[PDB]
Amino acid sequence: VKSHYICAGRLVRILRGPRQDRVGVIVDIVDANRVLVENPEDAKMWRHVQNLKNVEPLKYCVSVSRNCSAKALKDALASSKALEKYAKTRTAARVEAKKACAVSTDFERYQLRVARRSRAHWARKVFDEKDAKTPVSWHKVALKKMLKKAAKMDSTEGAKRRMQKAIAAR
Amino acid sequence: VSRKSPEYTTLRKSCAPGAIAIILAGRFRGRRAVILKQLPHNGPLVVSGPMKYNGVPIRRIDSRYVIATSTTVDISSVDTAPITAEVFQRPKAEKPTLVSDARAQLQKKIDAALIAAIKKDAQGKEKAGYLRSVFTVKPGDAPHRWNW
Amino acid sequence: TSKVHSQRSKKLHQLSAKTSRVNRNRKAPRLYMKGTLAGYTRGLHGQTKQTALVRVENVNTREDATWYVGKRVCYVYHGKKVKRCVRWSKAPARRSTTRALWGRVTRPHGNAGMMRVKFNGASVPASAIGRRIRVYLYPSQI
Amino acid sequence: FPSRKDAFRAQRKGAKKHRPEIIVIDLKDHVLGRAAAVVAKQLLLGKKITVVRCEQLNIAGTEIRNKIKYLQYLRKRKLTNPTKGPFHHRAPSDVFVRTVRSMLPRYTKRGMKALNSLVAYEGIPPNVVRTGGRVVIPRAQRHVCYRSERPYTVLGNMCKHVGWKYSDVVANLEKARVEKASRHHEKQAKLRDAWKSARKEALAKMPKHNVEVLKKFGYA
RNA sequence: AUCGAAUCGCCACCUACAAGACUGGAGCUUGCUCCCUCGAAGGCGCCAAGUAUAUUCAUGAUCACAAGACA
Numbered sequence: 001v002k003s004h005y006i007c008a009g010r011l012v013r014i015l016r017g018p019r020q021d022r023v024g025v026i027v028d029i030v031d032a033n034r035v036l037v038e039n040p041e042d043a044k045m046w047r048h049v050q051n052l053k054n055v056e057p058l059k060y061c062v063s064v065s066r067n068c069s070a071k072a073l074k075d076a077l078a079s080s081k082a083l084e085k086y087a088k089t090r091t092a093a094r095v096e097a098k099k100a101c102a103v104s105t106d107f108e109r110y111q112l113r114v115a116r117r118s119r120a121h122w123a124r125k126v127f128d129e130k131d132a133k134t135p136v137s138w139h140k141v142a143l144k145k146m147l148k149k150a151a152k153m154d155s156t157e158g159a160k161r162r163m164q165k166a167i168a169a170r
Numbered sequence: 171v172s173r174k175s176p177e178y179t180t181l182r183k184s185c186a187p188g189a190i191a192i193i194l195a196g197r198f199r200g201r202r203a204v205i206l207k208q209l210p211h212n213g214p215l216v217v218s219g220p221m222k223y224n225g226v227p228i229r230r231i232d233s234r235y236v237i238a239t240s241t242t243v244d245i246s247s248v249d250t251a252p253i254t255a256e257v258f259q260r261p262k263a264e265k266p267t268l269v270s271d272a273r274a275q276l277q278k279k280i281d282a283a284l285i286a287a288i289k290k291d292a293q294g295k296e297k298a299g300y301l302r303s304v305f306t307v308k309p310g311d312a313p314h315r316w317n318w
Numbered sequence: 319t320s321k322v323h324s325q326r327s328k329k330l331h332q333l334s335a336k337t338s339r340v341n342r343n344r345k346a347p348r349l350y351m352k353g354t355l356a357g358y359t360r361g362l363h364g365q366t367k368q369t370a371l372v373r374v375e376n377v378n379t380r381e382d383a384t385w386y387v388g389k390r391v392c393y394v395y396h397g398k399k400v401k402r403c404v405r406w407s408k409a410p411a412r413r414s415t416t417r418a419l420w421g422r423v424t425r426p427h428g429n430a431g432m433m434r435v436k437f438n439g440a441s442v443p444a445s446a447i448g449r450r451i452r453v454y455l456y457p458s459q460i
Numbered sequence: 461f462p463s464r465k466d467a468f469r470a471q472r473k474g475a476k477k478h479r480p481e482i483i484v485i486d487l488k489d490h491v492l493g494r495a496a497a498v499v500a501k502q503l504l505l506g507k508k509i510t511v512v513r514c515e516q517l518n519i520a521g522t523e524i525r526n527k528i529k530y531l532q533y534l535r536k537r538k539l540t541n542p543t544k545g546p547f548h549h550r551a552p553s554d555v556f557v558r559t560v561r562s563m564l565p566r567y568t569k570r571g572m573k574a575l576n577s578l579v580a581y582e583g584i585p586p587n588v589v590r591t592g593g594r595v596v597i598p599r600a601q602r603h604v605c606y607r608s609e610r611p612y613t614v615l616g617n618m619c620k621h622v623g624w625k626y627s628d629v630v631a632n633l634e635k636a637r638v639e640k641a642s643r644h645h646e647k648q649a650k651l652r653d654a655w656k657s658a659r660k661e662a663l664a665k666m667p668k669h670n671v672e673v674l675k676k677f678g679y680a
Numbered sequence: 681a682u683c684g685a686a687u688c689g690c691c692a693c694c695u696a697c698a699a700g701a702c703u704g705g706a707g708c709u710u711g712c713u714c715c716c717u718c719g720a721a722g723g724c725g726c727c728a729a730g731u732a733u734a735u736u737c738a739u740g741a742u743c744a745c746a747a748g749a750c751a
């Protein structure tokens with residue numbers, strides 16, 4: 001059903017509060033509203049209670065039992081290699097990028113602005129060449145339709161004489 | 171040490187000489203310049219820019235009208251000694267483009283030294299582009315949350 | 319003797335010699351935040367007109383509003399005739415019907431980022447309710 | 461319709477076409493009261509707002525219950541002379557306008573200006589179709605406001621059964637609009653794909669340290 | 681033609697649609713596994729038509745509506 005269930009050993013990410021954007025492992029279920037979360041890797045994630053409204057389940061579940069010991073939890077995490085797998089996802093990279101953007105200086109924001117502008121300029125260069133070959137923009141589509149009708153009647157004898165006189169006059 | 175001494179100062183630590191600042195008011199609002207020194211008796215700051223990059227000349231400005239960033243340029247070898255209050259003193263006029271030769275020469279010397287220092291410093295091209303850039307407040311921006 | 323002939327030759331050159339360009343904003347910079355005058359401080363008993371309440375864009379917490387304490391505030395409008403202004407003789411280009419009233423931010427208001435504003439001397443007119451207020455970045459603490 | 465004097469002044473001044481800043485709100489699947497409260501506060505703060513698709517608003521409860529409430533409202537009438545009495549509007553857009561008006565100080569010039577700054581439509585008219593992207597109010601949407609087990613009503617059906625006379629016309633116009641927009645969006649897919657491909661390809665041509673900065677800030 | 685004015689993002693990539701008890705694709709074991717573009721970014725715009733050792737800015741003299749506005 002592509003929805004991640006709440007169960008013992010499920011990795012979650014904290015949504016709001018002082019522990020925002022950190023990850024932890026569910027070790028027990030209290031009731032429909034609360035769970036127990038711990039993570040030996042992070043220094044601010046000792047065993048504590050989290051309300052289920054503040055939790056986003058992930059796609060990884062380690063194999064542990066309810067109320068497992070600290071030693072058992074640490075061994076299971078290394079064996080599963082779930083933290084290494086999670087760190088390579090796109091959403092994980094997005095979270096680290098937001099932290100970098102919130103601490104940036106004025107000089108770093110200038111560097112980003114240059115990089116974005118350089119990309120947009122080169123995008124226009126690439127788009128223009130393919131556009132000339134295959135017409136896809138509004139103006140090149142108009143040119144393709146207009147040239148065929150305009151050329152056949154611009155070859156009239158009177159048109160050529162008038163064009164020659166007008167060009168010569170200039 | 172004495173409050174009557176000309177060396178007395180209460181300027182905040184961010185506005186150190188050689189730092190890059192953003193002008194918030196006046197003719198050159200929005201441009202970025204380099205802080206050179208503070209005039210004695212807790213006076214205003216002096217900024218150059220220099221003029222070749224953004225068009226700001228050597229000018230006085232109150233510290234409350236700039237934002238001092240954390241980007242700095244080593245200006246130890248600039249020798250900002252001739253810049254004094256006498257050069258900014260103006261002759262009174264009674265009963266009623268144009269730049270003095272001394273002011274032009276001082277501007278030329280200071281600008282040459284500053285350009286040399288910027289080029290010698292690492293990330294010189296990035297610093298030059300940063301000095302050329304312009305600051306503005308766009309819709310959706312929240313400067314009260316930024317780190318400078 | 320028909321204008322269709324000269325127009326289409328201009329059009330053929332015009333839409334064939336044009337490339338992919340964008341609009342770039344290189345005008346004079348803006349160095350203030352945009353705000354709106356919500357009204358005056360009041361209770362159920364009535365209003366108190368010497369303090370004004372201002373809502374600023376992208377300021378939605380009390381901690382955000384603390385950053386703006388002490389900043390200068392301006393309200394811009396126009397009259398009917400040209401009157402005296404700053405640098406009336408030094409800079410004749412400034413003469414206009416445009417006028418301004420100045421004030422300062424004193425303290426936050428509530429938990430949502432509203433601010434209290436005091437104006438120099440007199441109080442802001444009631445015709446300014448619902449109109450634009452400028453909040454500058456000086457005096458600077460950084 | 462503008463006056464000839466205004467047209468002559470515009471020609472003399474030589475100015476371009478002007479449009480004030482206007483926010484367009486798609487009101488489909490929105491809670492009537494909460495949407496009205498938010499809109500009224502924004503109008504008092506001084507925005508210009510245009511709402512579309514007013515016939516697809518939602519009210520909690522059953523259609524019979526809300527129809528009975530409207531009939532109870534319709535009963536109110538000045539006995540001595542009904543031409544001076546309350547005026548009961550049947551169109552959904554008028555219903556929304558009245559609901560907003562009840563949340564404003566309508567007997568002051570400030571309240572009247574705020575009310576006149578609002579324009580309401582049923583469906584999406586052609587003069588509004590191409591003006592830019594529409595917005596929603598997250599704190600007034602049905603899928604986050606109502607518990608899904610409870611029944612709800614759609615304003616269009618209630619209005620149709622209490623006296624509104626243009627539901628079929630609105631439905632036909634909406635169907636035509638959706639078909640036309642679907643055809644136009646099916647076109648230009650090649651243009652969108654070309655732009656995406658060009659953005660993908662520009663990375664190989666841009667400078668490497670710029671690529672590194674983009675990767676560091678997550679825009680790669 | 682009086683007229684001096686307040687307003688300060690624009691696009692011919694948003695400007696089509698529907699659902700939050702089911703969103704990229706499969707598999708049975710129905711909540712787990714596997715594959716993919718990895719499932720929390722409309723595009724530009726912020727001073728060299730583009731990231732390079734190119735180029736006029738003052739005396740408008742320390743704030744003052746922004747002395748400027750067809751991006």
Ligand SMILES: [K+]
Pocket residue numbers: 536537538542543544545546547
């Ligand atoms: K009546």
Ligand SMILES: [Mg+2]
Pocket residue numbers: 230258741742
């Ligand atoms: Mg001076």
Ligand SMILES: [Mg+2]
Pocket residue numbers: 562563564
């Ligand atoms: Mg009321």
Ligand SMILES: [Mg+2]
Pocket residue numbers: 416745746
């Ligand atoms: Mg002006």
